[PDB]
UniProtKB/Swiss-Prot annotation, chains A, B:
GO terms for biological process: amelogenesis; bicarbonate transport; digestive tract development; monoatomic anion transport; negative regulation of CD8-positive, alpha-beta T cell differentiation; negative regulation of CD8-positive, alpha-beta T cell proliferation; osteoclast differentiation; positive regulation of enamel mineralization. Sodium-independent anion exchanger which mediates the electroneutral exchange of chloride for bicarbonate ions across the cell membrane. Plays an important role in osteoclast differentiation and function. Regulates bone resorption and calpain-dependent actin cytoskeleton organization in osteoclasts via anion exchange-dependent control of pH. Essential for intracellular pH regulation in CD8(+) T-cells upon CD3 stimulation, modulating CD8(+) T-cell responses. Residues 36-497 are annotated as: Membrane (anion exchange). The chain crosses the membrane at residues 36-59, 65-102, 112-144, 154-175, 191-208, 224-244, 278-300, 326-349, 367-412, 439-475. Keywords: Anion exchange, Antiport, Cell membrane, Glycoprotein, Ion transport, Lipoprotein, Membrane, Methylation, Osteopetrosis, Palmitate, Phosphoprotein, Transmembrane, Transmembrane helix, Transport. Residues 209-223 are cytoplasmic. GO terms for molecular function: chloride:bicarbonate antiporter activity; enzyme binding; monoatomic anion transmembrane transporter activity; solute:inorganic anion antiporter activity. One of its GO terms (cellular component) is membrane. The gene is SLC4A2. This is Anion exchange protein 2.
Length: 497, 497
C-alpha cells in the first residue's frame, strides 16, 4: 500500500513516481474517449463557480488584496502544473472553505498587529515549502491513517457550516447596507432582490439535483440535465437579473484582462523583505506556527481526498500518490504565495465529481483536469460577462453547495437521529449494534467538539482553529476509547461503510 | 342506499330526515369527548383562511360589492343553520374556487350588459331555490351516480389550476402596480416584499405539511404541529411583515364591526325589483340559465363531497343525506343572495379534514361544525388584527392549498406518468392492466377536455363553464366508451381504488 513507510528518504515520493510516471503516455492516450469531453464540461463549472465565489469572498474580507483574478490565476496555474506532474490528476485542486477561513483569520491577525498581509503570506509559504519537504522526506503521510471518521466528519460539518454562515452573513450585510426604507448604499429593492436571487438560485439548483435522482425523463437526459444543476441555475438567475433594468445588485467585479484586483495596493511579485514597510525579523521566523496550521488543513484535505478516491471500489488501476500530491501541492502553494496567490488543496467534492465523471459502468486521464484548469484560466480572458453575474446568485450556489455537502456525512445522519423516535432509526450498523443512549452520547461528544471548534474560530484565537481540529485525533485515541467500548467504537468510527 | 329513488315526492328528503333526526340528541351527547375541541381548533383556521382569501378576491373582482365581511357572515350563518338542520353536519360549508370563478363571470356579464350585479344575484337565488325544490321533489340527486371519476378529477384539477392562476395573477398585478424602479402605486420594495411573503408562507406551510408525514418528533407532537401547517405559517409570515416598519404591503382590509364592505354602494337587503336602477323584466326570467349553471357547481361539489365522506371505510353510523343537504344548501344560498351574500357549497377538502379530525382509530357531532361557524362569524368581531394580515401571506396559503389539492387526483398522477419512462410507472391497476399508449391516450383526452374548459372559462363565454363541465358526463358515456374497451375503462375510470 502507498502508506507503507520505508527507511529510505523520500520513499513515498519515489514509489509514487515509479508507480504513475511509467503510465505517462497512456494517461494522454486514454483521454480520446468521447466521455472525457462530457466530463470536462461537467466539472468546468463545478470548478469555476467556487473559484469566483471564493475570490469575491477574499476580495471582501482582505480589502481586494486577493480576489477573483488572483484566485482564478492560482487555480488555473496550480491545476495545470499538478495535472502535468501530479500522481493523481483526477484530483481537482481548488480553494476550499477552511483555507478561506484561515486566510481571513491571518488577515485579521496582521491588521491587528500592524503587519503586511502579503509578506506574511510569503513567509508562511516559505515555511510551508520547508514543512512539505521535511514531511515527504520522513514519509509522514502515513499519519493520514490516524485521521479517523471522528475527525473527517467534524471537519466536513465545519466546512458546510462555514458555507451556510458566510451566505447568511452576506445576506444580512446586504440588508444592512440597503435597508428597507421608502422614498452604493440605501438603494431600494436591492436587499429584497438579492434575497430573491439567492433563494431562486438555491431552489433551482436543489430541485435540479433532485431531478437528477428522479425518474421523469429518459435515463440519459435526466443525468445530463442533473449534472448541470449549477450552470443552469446560475444562467437562469443571471438572465432574470439581466431582465430587471433599474434595480441595483452587486456584481462579481472581476478586473481587466490579466491584472491584479488592487493594482494600486500590490503588484504581481510580493517583496519578501517588505512591501513599502519594513517587515520585522521576528515574524519571518514566527510564521512557522501559521505555516503549521495551514499545512494541517492542506494535509488533511488533500490526503483525505486521496484516500477517498483511491478506494478499491473506485477501481483506480494506476494508483494515486499520497506523498507526491502532498509535496506538489504544499510546495506549489508556498511558491505561489510569493506572487500573492492563494494556496490551494485538493477538494474532495470536486475531485469525487470528477472521478465519477470518468467512471464507466475510470478513464484516468490527465487532459481532462488540464483542460479544466486552462478553461478556468481563460475565464479571466472572458472578463466581462463575468462581472454581470450578481453576487446573490453566487451566494445562492454557495448555500446550495454548503447544504448538499452535508449529505452523506455520518455525523449529520446521527444528528438527524437525535430527534427521531428510537423506532424510526434506519437499519444501519451504528444503530443496530449500539444502544441509543450511547449513539446519542457519541453524537453529543462530537457536537461538543464541533462547538468548541466554532467558538475558537469565531473568537480572537481563530488561528488556532486547525490545531484544535487535530486535537480531536488524540482525543478519539485516548478519551473516547476509555469512555466507549471497542464494540461501540468499531461501529461508530467505522473506517468504511 | 340513500341514492335509491322512490316514487313518493321528497322521498330522499323524508328518508334522510327519518334516518338522521332521531339521533339529534345523540349528536350533541357524542361531542363531549376532548378530541372535539382539538378538531374545532384544527378546522377553524382551515375554514377561516379560505373565507378571508375568497372575500378579498371577491372585493377585488366585484368592486367591493361582496367582500370579506359578506363572505364571513354568509359562511357563519349558513354553517350555523346547516349544522343545526343538516343531515351530515360533518360537511363543512364554505366558498369554493369554482363559485368564485362563476361570480366573477356573472359580474363581468352584468357590467358588459349594463345590469346590476346584486339584483341579478337575487334572481339567480330565487331560481336556485325553485330548482332545488324541483330536484329534491323528483329525487334527481341519484344523478350524482353518473358523475364518474372522469368528471370529478377534471373538476378538481380545474379548481387547483384556478387557485394557482389567481395567486400568480395577483403577484403579477402587484409587480405592475409597484414596479421595480429607483428613486398607493409606485411604492418601492412592495412587489419584492409581497413575493417574499408569498413564497415564505407557501414554503413554511409546505414544509410543515411534510413534517406532519415525517418522523422527527413524538408521533403525537408531529401530527399536532403538522395540523397547524397553515396557522403557523400565517402567524410567522405576519409577524415578519409586522417587524418591517417602513415598507408598504396591501393588508386584508376587513370593514368595521358588522358592516358592509361598501356601505355607499349597497345595503344589507338587496331590492329585488331594482336598486337605484330599474331591473329589466327580461333578466328576472332569463336568470334561469345562470341559476342552472350555479346549481350544477353546487350540486356537483356538495354531492361529490357527500359521496366522499359517506364511504363505508369512513364508518359513518348515522348516515349522510344526499337530498337534505342539497336542498338545505341550495335553498339557503338562494335566500342568502337576497341579502347580498355569496352562496356556498360543501367543500370536499375542508369536510374531509373535519371528518378525519373526528376519526378514532367518527365522533359524528354537530357542535364542532356549529362552533367553527360561530367562531368564523366572530372573526369579524375581531375586526382589527385581521386587517394587519398582508394579502401576500393569504395568497401564499392560497397557492399552498391549490398545490396540495392536486395530490391524490388520479388525473394528476397519470399526468406525471406522461413523462416518466414506462419502466418506472408505479404498480397500480390502471398501469398494469392498460397498455401505456392507451393510458396516455386517456390522459390526453382528459387534458383536451380540461383545456377546452379553461379556454371557455377564459373567453367571453365564461358563464357556460359549468355546462361544458357536465358535457364530460355524456362524453364518457357515449364517446370514451366507443374508443376505449370495457377492460380499460373499468381500470381508468374506477369508481373507487
Ligand atoms: C421526452 C418526453 C418523455 C419521454 C419519457 C421516456 C419514454 O417515453 O420512453 C422512451 C421513449 O422516449 C421518447 O420517445 C422520447 C421522444 C423509451 O425509453 P427506454 O425505455 O428505452 O428507456 C429507459 C429509461 O430511460 C430508464 O430511465 C433508463 O434507466 P435508469 O438507468 O434507471 O435511468 C434506461 O432503462 P434500462 O437501462 O434499465 O433499460 C432506459 O433504457
Ligand atoms: C422532543 C425531542 C425529541 C424526542 C424524540 C422521541 C424520543 O426520544 O423518544 C420518546 C421520548 O421522548 C422524550 O423523552 C421527549 C422529551 C419515546 O417515544 P415512544 O417510543 O414512546 O414513541 C413512539 C413514537 O412517537 C412513534 O413515532 C409513534 O408512532 P407513529 O404513529 O408511527 O408516529 C408511537 O409509536 P407506536 O405507537 O408504534 O408504539 C410512539 O409510541
Ligand atoms: Cl469544498
Ligand atoms: Cl376548496
Amino acid at each position: 500500500d502507498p502508506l507503507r513507510r520505508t527507511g529510505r528518504p523520500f520513499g513515498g515520493l519515489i514509489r509514487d513516481v515509479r508507480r504513475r510516471y511509467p503510465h505517462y503516455l497512456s494517461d494522454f492516450r486514454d483521454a480520446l474517449d468521447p466521455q472525457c469531453l462530457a466530463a470536462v464540461i461537467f466539472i468546468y463549472f463545478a470548478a469555476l463557480s467556487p473559484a469566483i465565489t471564493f475570490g469575491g469572498l477574499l476580495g471582501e474580507k482582505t480589502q481586494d488584496l486577493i480576489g477573483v483574478s488572483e484566485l482564478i490565476m492560482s487555480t488555473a496555474l496550480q491545476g495545470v502544473v499538478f495535472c502535468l506532474l501530479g500522481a493523481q490528476p483526477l484530483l481537482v485542486i481548488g480553494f476550499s472553505g477552511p483555507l478561506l477561513v484561515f486566510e481571513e483569520a491571518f488577515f485579521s491577525f496582521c491588521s491587528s498587529n500592524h503587519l503586511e498581509y502579503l509578506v506574511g503570506r510569503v513567509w508562511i509559504g516559505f515555511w510551508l515549502v520547508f514543512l512539505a519537504l521535511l514531511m515527504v522526506a520522513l514519509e509522514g503521510s502515513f499519519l493520514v491513517r490516524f485521521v479517523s471518521r471522528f475527525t473527517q466528519e467534524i471537519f466536513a460539518f465545519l466546512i458546510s457550516l462555514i458555507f451556510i454562515y458566510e451566505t447568511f452573513y452576506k445576506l444580512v450585510k446586504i440588508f444592512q447596507e440597503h435597508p428597507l426604507h421608502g422614498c452604493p448604499r440605501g438603494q431600494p429593492n436591492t436587499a429584497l432582490l438579492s434575497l430573491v436571487l439567492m433563494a431562486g438560485t438555491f431552489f433551482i439548483a436543489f430541485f435540479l439535483r433532485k431531478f437528477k435522482n428522479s425518474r421523469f425523463f429518459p435515463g440519459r437526459i435526466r443525468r445530463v440535465i442533473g449534472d448541470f444543476g449549477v450552470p443552469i441555475a446560475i444562467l437562469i438567475m443571471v438572465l432574470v437579473d439581466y431582465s430587471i433594468e433599474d434595480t441595483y445588485t452587486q456584481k462579481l467585479s472581476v478586473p481587466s484582462g490579466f491584472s491584479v484586483t488592487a493594482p494600486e495596493k500590490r503588484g504581481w511579485v510580493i517583496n519578501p523583505l517588505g512591501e513599502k514597510s519594513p517587515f520585522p525579523v521576528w515574524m519571518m521566523v514566527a510564521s512557522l506556527l501559521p505555516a503549521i496550521l495551514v499545512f494541517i488543513l492542506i494535509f488533511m484535505e488533500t490526503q483525505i481526498t486521496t484516500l477517498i478516491i483511491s478506494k478499491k471500489e473506485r477501481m483506480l488501476q494506476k494508483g494515486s500518490g499520497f506523498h507526491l500530491d502532498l509535496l506538489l501541492i504544499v510546495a506549489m502553494g508556498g511558491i505561489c504565495a510569493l506572487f500573492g496567490l492563494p494556496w490551494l488543496a485538493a477538494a474532495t467534492v470536486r475531485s469525487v465529481t470528477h472521478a465519477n465523471a470518468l467512471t464507466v459502468m475510470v478513464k484516468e486521464q490527465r487532459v481532462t483536469g488540464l483542460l479544466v484548469a486552462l478553461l478556468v484560466g481563460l475565464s479571466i480572458v472572458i472578463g466581462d460577462l463575468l462581472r454581470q453575474i450578481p453576487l446573490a446568485v453566487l451566494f445562492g450556489i454557495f448555500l446550495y453547495m454548503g447544504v448538499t455537502s452535508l449529505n452523506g456525512i455520518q455525523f449529520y445522519e446521527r444528528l438527524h437521529l437525535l430527534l427521531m423516535p428510537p423506532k424510526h432509526h434506519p437499519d444501519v450498523t451504528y444503530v443496530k449494534k449500539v444502544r441509543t443512549l450511547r449513539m446519542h452520547l457519541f453524537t453529543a461528544l462530537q457536537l461538543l467538539c464541533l462547538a468548541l471548534l466554532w467558538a475558537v474560530m469565531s473568537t480572537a484565537a481563530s488561528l488556532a482553529f486547525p490545531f484544535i481540529l487535530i486535537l480531536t485525533v488524540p482525543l478519539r485515541m485516548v478519551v473516547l476509547t476509555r469512555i466507549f467500548t471497542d464494540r461501540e467504537m468499531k461501529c461508530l468510527d467505522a473506517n468504511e461503510a
